[PDB]
Design a protein around this ligand. Sequence first.
Ligand SMILES: O=C(O)CNC(=O)C(=O)O
Ligand SMILES: O=C(O)CNC(=O)C(=O)O
Ligand SMILES: [Zn+2]
Ligand SMILES: [Zn+2]
Lengths: 344, 344, 16, 16
Amino acid sequence: MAAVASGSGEPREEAGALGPAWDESQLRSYSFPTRPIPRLSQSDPRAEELIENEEPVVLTDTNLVYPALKWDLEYLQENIGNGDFSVYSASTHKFLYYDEKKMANFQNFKPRSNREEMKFHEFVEKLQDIQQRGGEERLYLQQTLNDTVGRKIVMDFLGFNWNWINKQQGKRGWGQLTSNLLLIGMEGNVTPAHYDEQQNFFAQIKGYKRCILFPPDQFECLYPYPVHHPCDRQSQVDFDNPDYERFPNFQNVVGYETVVGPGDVLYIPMYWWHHIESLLNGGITITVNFWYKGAPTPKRIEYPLKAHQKVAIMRNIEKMLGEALGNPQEVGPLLNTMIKGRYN
Amino acid sequence: MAAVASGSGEPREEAGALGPAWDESQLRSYSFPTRPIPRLSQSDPRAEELIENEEPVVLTDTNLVYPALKWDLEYLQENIGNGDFSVYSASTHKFLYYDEKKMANFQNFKPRSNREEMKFHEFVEKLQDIQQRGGEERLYLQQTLNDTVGRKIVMDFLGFNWNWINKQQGKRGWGQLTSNLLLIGMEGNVTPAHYDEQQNFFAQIKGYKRCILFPPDQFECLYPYPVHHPCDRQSQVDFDNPDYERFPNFQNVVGYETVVGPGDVLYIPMYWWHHIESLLNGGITITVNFWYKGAPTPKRIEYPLKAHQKVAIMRNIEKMLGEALGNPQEVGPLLNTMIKGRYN
Amino acid sequence: LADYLISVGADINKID
Amino acid sequence: LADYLISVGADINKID
Ligand SMILES: O=C(O)CNC(=O)C(=O)O
Ligand SMILES: O=C(O)CNC(=O)C(=O)O
Ligand SMILES: [Zn+2]
Ligand SMILES: [Zn+2]
């Protein structure tokens, strides 16, 4: 009987009989099924095939950020330098991303998280203050690595496996590395489902993160915000309380998931939705991603179109209409007028 | 109490005490209100103002087609030449226009009228055959005037008031005259509501036609077919039996109407919807229209946009998506995906 | 471009 | 053009 959906599978055993890395109670509970993302060696031809076909895979032995595996708050505070770091703060576990430039278009959007620039030692101290007073405030540091980092971090950065990732960039025809985002979160933090328009090698350093991915063909089930809204590219669906009246096809969504730990690298293909959560009671998490611009669009389109190309078309229709109407608020009414009693 | 809608008004009296030109029983009955289109002399500055503002007006004294006022079936059969004339045939009074080039896109569209090419004497004879046998078949001749017409028709054509209409073309910045369509219909024939993308001076020659116009801002109430459908630019609504479940905003439509007779010229502005019916029991009708390409689009758009510019935008979105998806049938599903739970 | 989207065609109820 | 509509941007969850 057809009535597969293993999810992250049986938790892995840490070497030296150090016990399970995590347990099922540290995962949040959601309404949809999932199947596992494959975990493979970087020397496995299957892994090359998945990356080539823009499908996710966890690579267990790239050594991509090997020198960063010794990173923790004390080491970073000593060596990360005196630059500013963007720290998001929220009274909820969900850190929904928003584009500050688009907030003028939507005056009624009130962010639930707020950004504060601070030095790294201030970040560590605010964490301490929270932890000792039993506070419910949550922090998520998210900052691109820049030229202000200290000498030891430079040394560690130079020690990444550029041989391997530069070869991937070349083999896939991708554009330049645009940035490395340092992500330091508290246990239980969640980045809600969204897609990015760049290719991502997501390199886990400390702690464990559950990553739930959805292919671009589930656009219909995930209901992104309007393109001019500050939450462009993020799902409108509250995974903790899905509104099935507004979002009926969320009842059909099916994810791919994995739990990445220190040394793992997750390939998140461009336009793939991803929901990322730091495991409950797992301590702080540290990740560095590697964002690459996608390979150029082919000069002559080949049919059938891929799912992500249809997403690109819809985004461009929304952008063009916003510019032509002179106001993004008129996009919706025009689109509805175009469809009602004509295409629906 | 605000609870104006005169319609065509009290029928006009024919000169020489020849009685009313028409009576209310010769008009079909419809569900919506209407107000009158103004009837003015071409020397009235109000008429110039209406044409300039792309609003309809009936001009009563242009002499635009003065030499054609003696036209009837016998005169035309003698002098119109031996060319082919497109004659549409239908078992209904409604002659819904369709684009034969688009029929490959929609295999399930079965036209209710059929086109037959014939000589003018064959057209007259088929009319006779119908009239004598009490048949229910209906014919509508619709043919652009071309270089095959006989010498007397050339003389009559040369006698049109080109001084007047060439001045209008110049004053409005319109493009070239593209064609003169000769329209010869049977009493009771109806051309269902549609808009054209050219400017039209509609010159009535024989019989009376009731013209019901709707401004471009009633797009929302009139539900045009998809752009790739053969009935592009025609309303989907059956005015004789409006489906208010599919077309709810047809309950809000408001028209402008008039009855034109011999010597009248109706300005039908580009993008204005028009429904045209030859009066019941009024005999055959003869019209010649004058179609002009619109004035060029301004280089820099000025806001707010006019209603017809929003129509132009929607048409271009539908066209572009058809080309990009490689198949017009995919337009609807993509548009719905773009709107559902996002803009509606 | 914004200018292109406002551009009009010249389609009319007449066979080509 | 058909090519333009398929073109992608480079937007990511990162402040400029
Ligand atoms: O790690 C997180 O919490 C969120 N990360 C991303 O969305 C990403 O790397 O693209
Ligand atoms: O006269 C008719 O029956 C139909 N005419 C038109 O749609 C027109 O002239 O644009
Ligand atoms: Zn992301
Ligand atoms: Zn017309």
